[PDB]
Amino acid sequence: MKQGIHPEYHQVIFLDTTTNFKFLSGSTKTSSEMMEWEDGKEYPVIRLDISSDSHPFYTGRQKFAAADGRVERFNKK
Amino acid sequence: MISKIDKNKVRLKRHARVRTNLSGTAEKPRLNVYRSNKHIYAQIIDDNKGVTLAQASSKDSDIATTATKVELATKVGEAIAKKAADKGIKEIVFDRGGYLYHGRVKALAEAARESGLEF
Amino acid sequence: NRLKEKFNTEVTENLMKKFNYSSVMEVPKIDKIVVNMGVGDAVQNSKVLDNAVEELELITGQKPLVTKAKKSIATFRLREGMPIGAKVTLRGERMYEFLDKLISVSLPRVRDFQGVSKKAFDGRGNYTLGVKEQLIFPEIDYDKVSKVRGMDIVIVTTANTDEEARELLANFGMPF
Amino acid sequence: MLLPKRVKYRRQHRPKTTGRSKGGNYVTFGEFGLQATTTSWITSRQIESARIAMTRYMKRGGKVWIKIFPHTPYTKKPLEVRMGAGKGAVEGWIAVVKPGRILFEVAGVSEEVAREALRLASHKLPVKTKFVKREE
Amino acid sequence: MRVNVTLACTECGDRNYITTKNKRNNPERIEMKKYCPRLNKYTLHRET
Amino acid sequence: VSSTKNGRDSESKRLGAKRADGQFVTGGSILYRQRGTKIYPGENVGRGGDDTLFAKIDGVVKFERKGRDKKQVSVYAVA
RNA sequence: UUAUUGGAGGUAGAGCACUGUUUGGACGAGGGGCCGUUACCGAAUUCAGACAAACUCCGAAUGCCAAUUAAUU
RNA sequence: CUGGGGCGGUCGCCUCCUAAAAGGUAACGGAGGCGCUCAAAGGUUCCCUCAGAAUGGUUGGAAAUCAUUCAUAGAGUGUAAAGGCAUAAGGGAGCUUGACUGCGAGACCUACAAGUCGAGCAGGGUCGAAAGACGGACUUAGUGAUCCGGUGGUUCCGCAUG
RNA sequence: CUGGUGACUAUAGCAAGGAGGUCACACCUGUUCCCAUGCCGAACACAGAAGUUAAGCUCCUUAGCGUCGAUGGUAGUCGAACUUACGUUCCGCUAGAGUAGAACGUUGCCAGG
Ligand SMILES: [Mg+2]
Ligand SMILES: [Mg+2]
Ligand SMILES: [Mg+2]
Ligand SMILES: [Mg+2]
Ligand SMILES: [Mg+2]
Ligand SMILES: [Mg+2]
Ligand SMILES: [Mg+2]
Ligand SMILES: [Mg+2]
Ligand SMILES: [Mg+2]
């Protein structure tokens, strides 16, 4: 690739918080949070509300509402 | 489904366009270069008669060895220059074969120049 | 390169066994991914095209090529040479990263998602997916999105048939 | 009234009329045909007159084909002008007919009916004609 | 191009060449290298 | 009343061959005046800015086939 | 002048490959009135048949330019 | 000029047909263009190949942009037509100013005056590794004699001499 | 026989079917280096040799398309005689279309086998 034209690119771990499922891939989201990975190096983490392993269409199961959500507050009521 | 182009065919179209304007004479024969994924070949051709005068390839046992392709191109240039000088040829026109004048082709040409072929 | 490793290990073997290829060189692979955004309203406001280019660059990771009108059209008020689109070509590791990201992080963010069209094959082993909201992609913050616009993602494969392309994309994990 | 929907040139040199029929000299669509034996210009109006005569006699029973078409515009000067000052305006449209050309063809009727229909047609045309059958 | 132009050598001043330019496209005094016979060399000429 | 809007034509340019196949010509002789390359320059023949074909050497004119559809003219020195 | 040999060139004729003109069919990507099926199929394709100074896939007779050319003049 | 004259039209230049397969060839015959444009739309080096259709794809529809396949030229070539051009004369980029100075064997055209083509030599350059290409533009219109006057240059003259 | 590089109006091409891979040609593995992409190491360039004949490429078969193509006859026509007839006759030349048929190349130089 040419130098100085492309946006900054780096490895990141997308973490589906619903299932606490982590997947490594490149992106340019540059989250401050850092986490360790099975390889010795550590890369920043991108929080993700819904993912392939959590979406109902992909999974075949009903999705689980997250904490502090609308459903949780409604049930607390 | 996406096709893959034939690099040699593209190369040959370019070479034909080069050769409309570039041709080799008995006094100033054409130094032609052919390049493969592994080897590089050089000929000296008189186009009026359609006869080769000298030949040298990186695939030849005399030149064949373990070296980078650019070093092998240098060796082929030196060899073809020496054989042309032995046959009594100084002035030639360099036919880059439709390849860009760069890298291996360029190294071969510069080797021939240094070996004493006058372009 | 998790997706590339999956292709090398599992998808290759599955597809080869399914289609009885005498040689490994017959195994289809995803040649490239072209992400195109056609901005016809750039005729009226070039800033829209600039924003589209910025968003596409953020999504893809590399600077897009600006595509200009091939011919002049009176009805669209389009003059030849006016930039009316953006396009990015992804190959290799960047392509695979974008593909897995699209499959996993991006696609499920579609409201009322029910899978992607299984008939969106050109007829020769290439698949075109029409996304309708840039906001799908994780790299874009809805605050900075002045306008919402879609994209065409063309996955160009070496498969000679729609059946083989479908098998390859399914093994990769494409919903349908 | 036949005439081309358009032409590139409205003012054209008048066609050569010597020689023999270049083509279309055989019955190829119907069973019977009307063959020109002398040379003439044939106008759109003459074609229409002849077609009406033969079709009316055939009483819609059979099928008619017009094998000639008036491609060629011809001009005429306005009345009472001197020579010169440019070529005149298009007056009509004509097909050139030479000996051997089939003018009309008919099918779907008896030979006798075809003969009478084509006789009635021939009296509308400025050329001599003969009744012809498909050759073999 | 829509106006005639005289190019004068910027070293000796000789008006060596005439040419043409579009005045709306090139409102400035155009300059270019041209051969100067008096000096027997290429010099920068510019529109008078 | 009546007039023609026609009545114009440009001067004829005397194009075509100016020397015959087999004829001896001196260097510089025009061999063929043309628009475009209806005929191509062959050996020892040049093509001027207006497509005129002219001889570069003294010699014999020869009109020759050039491939399947094209043709050229060449000039060859006499022994 | 003739004989022989070479060459330039697009006419006569012819043809429809291009640009246009044009007659009968076949078939129909697709939607509409129609339930699937009895218009338009205006698209595309295809068969057969025609027209052209400013059409040409072809192409004469002649005429023309030449030849260390022969005969007659 | 004029199928009497007037009135109308026309008057120079380019392309095509008429034009009878070299060239030339008329009419108040049939059709159109010109009185420019471009600082790149010129030079050179390197690279590239179209129009259209089918099938998929969002805003996008018959046509915008993307992708594959087919597609030999139906595109493009500043501008009329014709002849050419896909070994490009078409398209893109880098560097450039040969859109040079002195000329010019030979040739076309031709009543004259003019008009056109031109290898090659010398000087000093541009691009190219080099061979080499370049004295504008794919080609053919885009123009006006002399006299007189203006401006710049000039180892020319200067009415006894300076 | 294979390759490189030439010559020849496709009789050489297209299409379809089949065969091949110490070496060679490829696809192929990568982007440190020279070099590159109006984005993309796709391409160009370079480094390299794990994999594959799948494709390219080469070779073999054929006559579906394209190409070539008579003889015979016809159109046209130079010249001559007669004629005024949208003409006739005689002589020479002689198409286009179509038919038979040809054809899935022929060859020069160089280096390897
Ligand atoms: Mg003319
Ligand atoms: Mg010129
Ligand atoms: Mg004719
Ligand atoms: Mg009178
Ligand atoms: Mg003549
Ligand atoms: Mg003529
Ligand atoms: Mg141009
Ligand atoms: Mg004095
Ligand atoms: Mg024949």
Query: What DSSP assignment string belongs to chain C?
Result: -HHHHHIIIIIHHHHHHHHT-SSGGGS--EEEEEEEEE-GGGGT-HHHHHHHHHHHHHHHSSPPEEEE-SS-BTTTTB-TT-EEEEEEEE-THHHHHHHHHIIIIIGGGSTT-----SS-B-SSSEEEEEE--GGGSTT--TTT-SS---EEEEEEES-SSHHHHHHHHHHHT---
Q: Measured in whole angstroms, how far is the alpha carbon of residue E27 from the centre of its chain?
A: 14
Which nucleotide is at minimal CA–C1' distance from D23?
G50
Catalogue all structural domains in chain D, each as residue range(s) with its CATH number. 24-136 (3.90.1170.10)
From F3's Cα to the closest Cα of chain D, the distance in A is: 5
- Give me the phi and psi of D30, to 5 degrees please: -105, -165
- Note whether A23 contacts C139, CB cutoff 8 Å: no
Domain C4-168 has CATH 1.10.150.120: no
Q: Which residue has the tokens 């997706």?
A: C3
Beta bridge mates, D33: D105, D132
Cα separation of B57 and C129, whole Å?
Answer: 51
With a 7 Å cutoff on the CB, does F30 touch strand G?
Answer: no
Compare all CA atoms of chain D with the CA of F1 and give the residue at the minimum distance: D85
Number of CB pairs < 8 Å for B and C? Answer: 14
Cα separation of D106 and C175, whole Å?
Answer: 66
Enumerate residues 6+ apart whose C-beta is below 8 A from A35.
A13, A15, A22, A42, A43, A44, A45
Cα separation of A6 and A47, whole Å?
Answer: 24
DSSP for residue B89: -
Q: Are F52 and F29 in contact (CB under 8 A)?
A: no
DSSP-assigned letters across all residues of F5-66: S----PPP---EESS-TT-EE-TT-EEEE-SS-SSEE-TTEEE-TTS-EEESSSEEEEEEEE
Q: Two tokens at A50?
A: 């819904």
Enumerate residues 6+ apart whose C-beta is below 8 A from B25.
B46, B47, B48
| Terminal C-alpha separation, chain B | 46
C159 touches chain B (CB under 8 A): yes
Report how many domains make up chain B. 1
Closest CA to A14 of A46, A42, A39: A46
With a 7 Å cutoff on the CB, does F33 touch strand H?
Answer: yes
Cα separation of B20 and B17, whole Å?
Answer: 5
Q: Are F21 and F61 in contact (CB under 8 A)?
A: yes
Local structure of F77: helix, strand or coil = coil
Ligand 6 geometric centre to CA of B42 (Å)? 53
Residue-wise over E8-45: b if at least 16 C-beta within 10 A, else e?
A: bbeeeeeebeeeebeeeeeeeeeeeebebeeeeeebeb
Straight-line distance from CA F64 to C1' H25, in Å? 31
- Note whether C62 contacts A6, CB cutoff 8 Å: yes
Domain limits, chain C: 4-168
Domain limits, chain F: 15-79
Local structure of D129: helix, strand or coil = strand
Closest CA to B43 of B31, B35, B51, B61: B31
G strand bases under 7 Å from protein CB: 5-9, 12-15, 20-24, 48-55, 58, 65-68
Q: Which residue has the tokens 């005289």?
A: E6
Report the CATH number that the domain containing residue B28 is assigned in CATH: 3.30.420.100
- Give me the phi and psi of C14, to 5 degrees please: -60, -50
Q: Measured in whole angstroms, how far is the alpha carbon of residue F60 from the centre of its chain?
A: 15
Question: What's the domain range around B33?
Answer: 21-110
With a 7 Å cutoff on the CB, does C44 touch strand H?
Answer: no
Task: Name the packing angle between helices C12-19 and C162-172 (round to 10°).
Answer: 150
Q: Which residue has the tokens 């001599």?
A: D128
Strand C65-68 with C83-90, pairing: antiparallel
C103 touches chain A (CB under 8 A): yes
Cα separation of B68 and B76, whole Å?
Answer: 12
I strand bases under 7 Å from protein CB: 4-7, 9-10, 24-28, 31, 34-49, 51-57, 75-76, 86-87, 108-112
Of the candidates A14, A25, A57, which has its C-beta nearest C113's C-beta?
Answer: A57
Enumerate residues 6+ apart whose C-beta is below 8 A from C34.
C87, C88, C89, C90, C152, C153, C154, C156
Q: Measured in whole angstroms, how far is the alpha carbon of residue D85 from the centre of its chain?
A: 32
Closest CA to B30 of B47, B11, B14: B47
C156 touches chain B (CB under 8 A): yes
Cα torsion F29, F35, F40, F46: sign: positive
Q: Which residue has the tokens 């579009």?
A: E22
Q: Which residue has the tokens 């799908």?
A: C136
- Note whether C159 contacts B1, CB cutoff 8 Å: yes
E strand or H helix that includes residue D54: helix D44-58
From B59's Cα to the closest Cα of chain C, the distance in A is: 28
Experimental method: cryo-EM
